[PDB]
Amino acid sequence: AQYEDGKQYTTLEKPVAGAPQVLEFFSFFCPHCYQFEEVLHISDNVKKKLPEGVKMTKYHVNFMGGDLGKDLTQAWAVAMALGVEDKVTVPLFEGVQKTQTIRSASDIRDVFINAGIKGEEYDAAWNSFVVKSLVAQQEKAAADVQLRGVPAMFVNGKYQLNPQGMDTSNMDVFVQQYADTVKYLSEK
Secondary structure (H helix, E strand, O other): OOOOEOOOEEEOOOOOOOOOOEEEEEOOOOHHHHHHHHOOOHHHHHHOOOOOOOOEEEEEOOOOOHHHHHHHHHHHHHHHHHOOHHHHHHHHHHHHHHOOOOOOHHHHHHHHHHOOOOHHHHHHHHHOHHHHHHHHHHHHHHHHOOOOOOOEEEEOOOEEEOHHHOOOOOHHHHHHHHHHHHHHHHHO
């Protein structure tokens, strides 16, 4: 076939019921994730090719960056709860990996303040049980699918993208192959 198990994707030996349609995992400590976000715009290019009636989910993970890794997962819960994902994603990546100005929860908070989220609004969210369950959801989804590496994308809780098995001579071709794979899996 043109798309083959073990080549552009792998199948989960144990499928996950009720999982989000397109589920993506990342970490602000993850170097390929930085690329996926700022240079390749993977999420956005996948969206553009997905049928409609399809929801995309993106979750942060704990297993990189220790204590700060966990803070970043809570902050991402804050971003999702407030719907400010597209205002903090880039400054969080650059603060962690480029400028190295994020070293504490307070510095994460500064990124939101600078993006125009109010102190009051941020701290209440941070401390809310709505954010706590959102954190639980991120962990549960990761735990459900064995997750030891990011970036990662899962389709309908059954298929896992395999970017190692695609060309990387040309970044544009890589992205289209990746998105076309997601669309194919989607229709499977």
